[PDB]
Scaffold this active site. Sequence first.
Site, PDB file in Angstrom:
ATOM      1  N   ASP A   1      27.030  27.318  41.814  1.00 38.58           N
ATOM      2  CA  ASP A   1      26.625  27.955  43.073  1.00 38.58           C
ATOM      3  C   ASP A   1      27.601  27.630  44.210  1.00 38.58           C
ATOM      4  OD1 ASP A   1      24.232  29.255  42.092  1.00 38.58           O
ATOM      5  OD2 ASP A   1      22.910  28.189  43.483  1.00 38.58           O
TER       6      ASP A   1
ATOM      7  N   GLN B   1      39.427  33.625  47.575  1.00 41.01           N
ATOM      8  CA  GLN B   1      38.705  33.483  48.852  1.00 41.01           C
ATOM      9  C   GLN B   1      38.831  32.109  49.499  1.00 41.01           C
ATOM     10  OE1 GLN B   1      34.809  35.008  47.231  1.00 41.01           O
ATOM     11  NE2 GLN B   1      34.649  35.954  49.251  1.00 41.01           N
TER      12      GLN B   1
ATOM     13  N   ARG C   1      35.966  35.133  42.618  1.00 41.05           N
ATOM     14  CA  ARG C   1      35.972  34.918  41.166  1.00 41.05           C
ATOM     15  C   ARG C   1      36.687  36.054  40.444  1.00 41.05           C
ATOM     16  NH1 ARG C   1      29.523  33.256  40.768  1.00 41.05           N
ATOM     17  NH2 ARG C   1      29.600  31.804  42.555  1.00 41.05           N
ATOM     18  N   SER C   2      36.465  37.302  40.891  1.00 40.71           N
ATOM     19  CA  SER C   2      37.117  38.455  40.251  1.00 40.71           C
ATOM     20  C   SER C   2      38.633  38.360  40.364  1.00 40.71           C
ATOM     21  CB  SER C   2      36.634  39.756  40.894  1.00 40.71           C
ATOM     22  OG  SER C   2      35.272  40.083  40.565  1.00 40.71           O
TER      23      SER C   2
ATOM     24  N   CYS D   1      32.098  40.356  40.853  1.00 38.97           N
ATOM     25  CA  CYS D   1      31.261  39.218  41.211  1.00 38.97           C
ATOM     26  C   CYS D   1      30.343  39.718  42.315  1.00 38.97           C
ATOM     27  CB  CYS D   1      32.137  38.017  41.550  1.00 38.97           C
ATOM     28  SG  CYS D   1      33.542  38.343  42.735  1.00 38.97           S
TER      29      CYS D   1
END
Length: 282
Positions: free
Chosen positions: A181, A262, A221-222, A215
């Site tokens: 998370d 990110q 994440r992508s 994502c």
Amino acid sequence: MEMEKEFEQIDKSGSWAAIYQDIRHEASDFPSRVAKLPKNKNRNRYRDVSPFDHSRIKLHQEDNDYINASLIKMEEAQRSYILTQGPLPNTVGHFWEMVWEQKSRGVVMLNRVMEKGSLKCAQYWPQKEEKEMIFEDTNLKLTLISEDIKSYYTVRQLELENLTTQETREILHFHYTTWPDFGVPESPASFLNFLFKVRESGSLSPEHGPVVVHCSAGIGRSGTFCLADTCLLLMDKRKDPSSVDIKKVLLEMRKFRMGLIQTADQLRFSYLAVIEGAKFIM
Ligand SMILES: COc1ccc2c(c1)OC[C@H]1CN3C(=O)CCN3[C@@H]21
């Protein structure tokens, strides 16, 4: 510089935030005018994540052709990817229309439907064989065929039917279920194992349309997934694998979608994944 020793040099000097801010400063800025039209407000999850006009995927519709999705075309590596946000309640039909129209074999999902107690994307695929889904706005039917649950990821076989023509196709759903998370994984081993399972299925290969990867926003994440895949392929293709420059590859990818990677922690994790992966390939 090479990668593994550039890596230790940034760790020892603790400069990951400065490296990452340089990337943000140098990244391309292209218009995203279609994304910002008022009629498309409920088609975007986040107001600061939009596809560029020049690389956006168009739906084959005359009313409204807009979806928050971008084509990342890597010329030297000879790989293409579609990066998209997690589908919204009012875009699940658009999502499967795109999969159909672009001739994709596989969908890669890197988030859970709920994270941090909030919804990160719609439940856009069926959970039981006998309870299929119909998307009336785009005239598609989606059926769960089989499901294989493993410790770090789940693979599903799905049938997508175009109800206008009665054509059917098999789609593979690759769901990485264990990204934490907060932060990034401690080891890249399960993420790399997952990448190799997607590769082995044919979903990334030129005989199919581009894989669809998402994502929640379709950039963090992508971005890690396609950056690691492309860097490893270039290390196999080139005479000198130490010439592959992960920062240059990332800036190339950011010509096609804003914001990829990110955080500085995601940047460090991408380096780690490529470094460990290059040892297993040989
Ligand atoms: C350190 O952890 C990993 C995990 C997976 C793999 C790693 C390291 O090395 C490179 C590729 C080559 N490979 C396959 O062909 C099947 C899985 N592995 C991948």
